[PDB]
C-alpha cells in the first residue's frame, strides 16, 4: 500500500491529477503488519494486532490526505473481521476513514446486493448544508425510518406484528419499503446474479425516497421494489407484478 500510495502521490503531486484510488484490504494490511511484528520480536498489543498498528494506519491515512495539487479520492476497504467493529483494526480504521460504507452481512441474508447497513454507515458529507437540505431532510426521514424499523424488530421478533400498532405497521411496511427500494442492482454485478445494474442518480433516488417515505409508493409492492433501480423502474416492475395474475 505504501508503494501504491507513492505512485498515487506521483499522480496527486507530480501529475497533480485527481486521484481515484481504490485499495483492499487494509484490514489484511493490518493483519500482515500484525504477523510481521510478531516476527519482529515486538509484543502484539491487541487481540492479534501489533502496537505499531496505530501510527502505521495513521501514516497510511496520512499520505491519503487529499492534496491541493491532486485531491485523493481514495476508496479503501476494511476486511472488517469477525463482524467485530470493536476489533481494534476496524475501530482504529473508523477514525481515519472519511466515509466508511458499513456493509452488512445481514442484508445479503436479506439478499440486498449491495448489503450496506446504511444505518451503520456515516458521511462527513451528510449535512443539509452539504447535501442539500432536501437531501438531508429526506435522508434523515429515511434514516429514522430505518431506526424505528430496527427498534420495531425487537417486539416484532418474538411477538409478531399483530401486537403492534397500525401506525407501527404503517412505519414498519414503510421502512420495509425503504429497505427494499434501497436494494437496486449494481452495474457489473451480473457475473454472480445476472442483472444489469442501473447507475441510480441522486435525484431519481430522491424522488423515490419521496414517494416511499411519503407513502406514494405505499401502494407499490415491497417485493416489487426489491433490486428496483428507479421509482419509475419500481413502478414498471410493480406494473409487471400487478400484471402478473
Amino acid at each position: 500500500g505504501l508503494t501504491a500510495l507513492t505512485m498515487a502521490e506521483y499522480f496527486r503531486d507530480v501529475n497533480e491529477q485527481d486521484v481515484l484510488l481504490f485499495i483492499d484490504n487494509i484490514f489484511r494490511f493490518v493483519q500482515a503488519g500484525s504477523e510481521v511484528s510478531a516476527l519482529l520480536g515486538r509484543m502484539p498489543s491487541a487481540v492479534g494486532y501489533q502496537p505499531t498498528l496505530s501510527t502505521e494506519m495513521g501514516s497510511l491515512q496520512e499520505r491519503i490526505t487529499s492534496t491541493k495539487e491532486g485531491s485523493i479520492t481514495s476508496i479503501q476497504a476494511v476486511y472488517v473481521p469477525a463482524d467485530d467493529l470493536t476489533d481494534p483494526a476496524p475501530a482504529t480504521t473508523f477514525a481515519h476513514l472519511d466515509a466508511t460504507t458499513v456493509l452488512s452481512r445481514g442484508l445479503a441474508a436479506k439478499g440486498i446486493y449491495p448489503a450496506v447497513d446504511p444505518l451503520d454507515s456515516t458521511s462527513t458529507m451528510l449535512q443539509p448544508r452539504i447535501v442539500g437540505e432536501e437531501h438531508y431532510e429526506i435522508a434523515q426521514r429515511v434514516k429514522e425510518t430505518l431506526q424505528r424499523y430496527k427498534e420495531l424488530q425487537d417486539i416484532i421478533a418474538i411477538l409478531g406484528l399483530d401486537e403492534l400498532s397500525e401506525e407501527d405497521r404503517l412505519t414498519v411496511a414503510r421502512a420495509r419499503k425503504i429497505e427494499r427500494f434501497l436494494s437496486q442492482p449494481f452495474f457489473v454485478a451480473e457475473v454472480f446474479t445476472g442483472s444489469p445494474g442501473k447507475y441510480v442518480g441522486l435525484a431519481e433516488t430522491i424522488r423515490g425516497f419521496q414517494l416511499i417515505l411519503s407513502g406514494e409508493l405505499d401502494s407499490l409492492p415491497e417485493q416489487a421494489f426489491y433490486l428496483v433501480g428507479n421509482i419509475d423502474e419500481a413502478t414498471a416492475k410493480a406494473m409487471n407484478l400487478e400484471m402478473e395474475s
Binding site: 421478533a157 418474538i158 411477538l159 409478531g160 399483530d162 401486537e163
Partner: peptide
C-alpha cells in the same frame, strides 16, 4: 400467536 412466539423464542 403464543405458539408462533414460542417458536421464535
Amino acid at each position: 400467536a403464543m405458539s408462533n412466539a414460542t417458536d421464535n423464542a
